[PDB]
Write a structure and sequence with these properties.
The structure is a homooctamer.
Chain A: H1 9-14, E1 25-30, H2 34-37, H3 46-49, E2 51-52, E3 58-61, E4 65-68, H4 74-85, E5 94-100, E6 105-110, E7 116-119, H5 127-133, E8 146-150, E9 153-157, H6 159-164, E10 179-182
Amino acid sequence: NVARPNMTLESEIANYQYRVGPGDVLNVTVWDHPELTTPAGQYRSSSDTGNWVQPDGTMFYPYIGKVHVVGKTLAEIRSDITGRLATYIADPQVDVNIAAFRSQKAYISGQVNKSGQQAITNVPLTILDAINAAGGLTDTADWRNVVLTHNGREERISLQALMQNGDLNQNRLLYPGDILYVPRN
Amino acid sequence: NVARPNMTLESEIANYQYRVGPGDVLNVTVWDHPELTTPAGQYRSSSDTGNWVQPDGTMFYPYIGKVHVVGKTLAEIRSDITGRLATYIADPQVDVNIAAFRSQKAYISGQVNKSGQQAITNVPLTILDAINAAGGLTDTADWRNVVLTHNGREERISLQALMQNGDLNQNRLLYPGDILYVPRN
Amino acid sequence: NVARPNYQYRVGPGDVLNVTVWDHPELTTPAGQYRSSSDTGNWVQPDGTMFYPYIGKVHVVGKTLAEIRSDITGRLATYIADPQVDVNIAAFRSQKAYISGQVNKSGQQAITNVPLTILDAINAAGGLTDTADWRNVVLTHNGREERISLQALMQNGDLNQNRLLYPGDILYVPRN
Amino acid sequence: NVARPNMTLESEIANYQYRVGPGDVLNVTVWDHPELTTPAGQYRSSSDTGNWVQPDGTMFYPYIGKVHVVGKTLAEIRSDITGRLATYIADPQVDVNIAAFRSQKAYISGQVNKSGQQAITNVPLTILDAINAAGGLTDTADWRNVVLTHNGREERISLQALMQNGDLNQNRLLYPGDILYVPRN
Amino acid sequence: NVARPNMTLESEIANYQYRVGPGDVLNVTVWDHPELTTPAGQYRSSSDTGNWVQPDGTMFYPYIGKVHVVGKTLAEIRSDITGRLATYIADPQVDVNIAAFRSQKAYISGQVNKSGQQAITNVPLTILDAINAAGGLTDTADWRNVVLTHNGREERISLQALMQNGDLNQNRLLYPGDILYVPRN
Amino acid sequence: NVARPNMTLESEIANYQYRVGPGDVLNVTVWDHPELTTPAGQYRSSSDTGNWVQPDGTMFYPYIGKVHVVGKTLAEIRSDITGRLATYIADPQVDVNIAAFRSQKAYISGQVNKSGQQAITNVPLTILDAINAAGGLTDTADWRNVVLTHNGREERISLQALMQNGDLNQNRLLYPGDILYVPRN
Amino acid sequence: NVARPNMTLESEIANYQYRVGPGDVLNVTVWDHPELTTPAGQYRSSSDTGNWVQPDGTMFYPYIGKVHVVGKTLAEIRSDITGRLATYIADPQVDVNIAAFRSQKAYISGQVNKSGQQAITNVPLTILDAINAAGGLTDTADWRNVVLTHNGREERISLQALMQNGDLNQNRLLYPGDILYVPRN
Amino acid sequence: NVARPNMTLESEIANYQYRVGPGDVLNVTVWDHPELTTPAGQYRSSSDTGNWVQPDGTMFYPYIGKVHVVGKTLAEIRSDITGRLATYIADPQVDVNIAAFRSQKAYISGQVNKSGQQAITNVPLTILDAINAAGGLTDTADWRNVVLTHNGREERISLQALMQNGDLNQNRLLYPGDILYVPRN
């Protein structure tokens, strides 16, 4: 055997867009307004000082009040906060990113060297990324019969074919809640 | 098998909300009022400088005095503090989050790679989350007969089914004081 | 074994306290804002007092944080109008329990403002070793020995095996 | 065992040019304008304060708005931003670099001492770089039959020739998405 | 096997009084006088900026000169320094604690998991404290026959009786110069 | 065999001169102008704030614009920059060093305790320096037949004589692109 | 043995007085003169900012010039410096301590757990201190026959008698240059 | 036999004097001139901000330009700098030390626990220092026939004699370039 690529995976990475979910910590920057950008000062990390997304899908932001952010992209949230701050600040220059990815994760467990949660973020997490992020497989992984649970199905995945034969069809884009289990040999 | 739907598990997790308990350390941000936000300076962390929730369920806040927070969400506390601070500050802009989740915890132990307490927080902690946060299982886990102690009942849980067949009915949301024990087989 | 569903710290000598006086950083952070609160906090003396500026010696041992907050506030009112004060503990040094034997991390565990039960302490010690005589754990409390089965606690959910640990308690997990 | 050059390797390294991709974190210096260079102050790292590249290929920048940066080099982005800031700022002195390389990566797994993703950056990553960055091969690497998966086809590489005899014909430039797999014998 | 109360051990611990020795590093706080409290600024640790006790028992303090501190309690040193500073500052508010306990120590050696010096401090150090601070005993510890050397006298101690039978008469307060030796089985 | 003095290998080092390559990060100090030396403040390290050398061999510098630095020594770049800054500041006092050596490197693998890339910097890196920098040989090194690939030609090297006989003849100066392989005994 | 005392050692520690050597780093505090106390600012450690003692036994100090310190005590040095600063500063309040003990050291090698040099400092270092500071002995230490080299003479020490029988006569004060070797059993 | 002192150990050490080499990083303190002492702020380390000695023997210093420092002592460099600064600053108070010893090094390989380079610094580094600086010998070390390569001549050294018997003639002072090899038993 040799290759068996997948430019169909080119697709879910093409339009890949993260959407904010509850428990995320947002970091809002208002240029020329350090009283807004760093209300607790400059030393603490943005995740220790950022805005928490509540379970009802909003975050509080000063002057404008509650802002619905769940299910929106960063650019939409940036656009929505900017337009509402315009009431209180003339021509606000605002950006928004995510200080802590907490709402969405995948579960990479089994015969990997580090098991555990991996966040879904603004960057695509494929099976390839998660296995390499979990630090590769142990010597005793059944790397021909990796189990991916996604939206109610199981799918068998052959990492062996992915890496030793370049069968890119074995790669998948991971979604919130997915389980990637590497059984023991 | 395949992944079987849980009418219970994903309705517990959309409605999922944390309520403050005694011993939590809260963090209160008052925009334009660094003398309230950071009375001890910008450099210490929010848990080293936050407001402790006392056994009686209150925390002290300056000017407004004792604030009853136990049993309330962050949004309910934000509103409570905002309305009371408005006596001393015109139109106060206030948010509240948690610097230290110390009041509520689940106990994850036995044949896990990292035994011990895991805090209950504003992010759901399911069995799947807790096992992954505990580093996964040891090679000698009786992982078909995990014991969940919850509300004075013992439930038996197959992590084998959850991760190798995708059986999401094997998942549970973990609650404060729950015990999740993984025996040796 | 069954399955059931269902605390005030008091300051002692050697505790390091941390007093916040809003709008008075000269009181809150006399040594600056970088050092941790335990490196700048007020030490509780053997006689049960701590020094606080302008008010002098404050008796704190045997009191709750709220009692110390109220005591300090009443007295600072002589020197500062309407003082806004809180007090918490930056180092829990006076009271502890001893968790030893076949646990993965043996040692002292602090008694704090948060209840520390047996269950808390064993998980805090990182669980039992594989050679723990875990059915016959010894708790020493107030001069009297007691038999604790963590087996029944975790294998069967028997919460009657749990106990709130107290200052001075010894929880010893033997080898079988 | 005599060493030789390479078609692929060296025609493409003197030209080597990184191009920004989505998810990268950019760092923009505007001399004499700390309100622009450091809106969140001076303590947090570049990647904690930098500008995120959005999935549509743009980044926001104050006053000049959205800026298309994907596919472009740092020098070009510096010129783009400089030209646009000149509307708002007299003679702006701008530089741009990358605080976090997150869009592009190679996968280096198998019998190397440190498996995992390696970022594609402004410095070339050749096979020789990537193996050394992984701490070399284990004692059990089939180091004459390494599998490079690039553009959907496999190529067998002899690290033994490369790393013991400096045969650069075995060295390749690694590209975003390449899998370099060291099988065990 | 009922637990035995120790005769004069909590009599000894309720009167427990640290007294300063040569080499201790003290920390003096003079409220409203940061020029005195933090002469080297407020970033270095109090032990990096503290006052050293000299062999002759004195420490230097600005304006008041050398102060005799060895043999005294913190509360006594505070009182001595305050009365002296009142010559140079009106109603000085002073506290004193110890940034480094360097003068006095016990030695905990043998079949414990962590051998070494243990500092004598304002907090009573009992055998039970020191053994627990050493991390417990190895499994080869002759733990029925521990040897306490104190003031030129040998004592046999049974940690086995202390920990498995709660015999608190086995516990002892440790003093400067004491040797606690845990032999091999 | 013998342990001789030296000739021409001394000028090779006494004339040793690093020259800047693409991807180096430079650090320019302008005394009395913290707005140029540290445009992003004083806390971030020089390599997080310094000036990247682009592929085309230049770095941008405020007010003087692009500056050719590849191939030049630090002293020459300092001269070049000073003369040009004199147009915007003058009697301008300027120094230049390298915050991150990223462009040039040697590769050290085999039976060393620490395979990997070693940077070529302003301090000469000899084989001995590389081997010691690589943690020392393993117990199973063929330290009589270490292979040095430099500019295509391969060369038997005997670390053995370099240390059990102090034969400085075997040692060599490492150059950018050099490979050094320590074979299994 | 019983814990028979060492009587000269009882009073040898009384006269214990460190004296400054070449290479030591001193830290001079001048209250009300942070330009003298912290000429490099408040952030770097004392040992990064201290005054080096030169090989001639002198150190430079601003305004007063060059100061003989070797062979002298901290309190002697403090008086020397205070008296000469009174020219340039009114009623100077001065203290001196060592930020880095680099000049004097004892060698603790052999069957100790952590072998290496141990600094001679203002705090006495006895054999008892040094071995405990070495975290104790290996299981194969001939702890009955430790060898102490001091001012040329040799001198047999029973750590066995010291620690298990309390024999303080086996303790000794370590001086600069002393070698203490725990033989193989 | 009789226990011997040494015939050169403490005049080579009593006259020991480091001299600056290329690649050293120097640290120049000008009291009352923070703009000269900390041009990059007070937070970065001395070695992150110090003055690099160029291969030609010189370092740049503001106002006075090139300063020849190689082969000079610290005291000499301090005078030279002071004198020329005096042209520009009224009576400058200057000290100089070394933030990074990068020019001169000894190599200690063989049956020591941590091989590698050891810098030559302002404090003497005898064999007795470098071994303990490597913690010490593996217990499989030919510690009777340790080879020291200095200035071309081999020479045999017995570390067993130095420590079992306190023979000081075995200990030697290490010079730049020296190689000290510990053979395996």
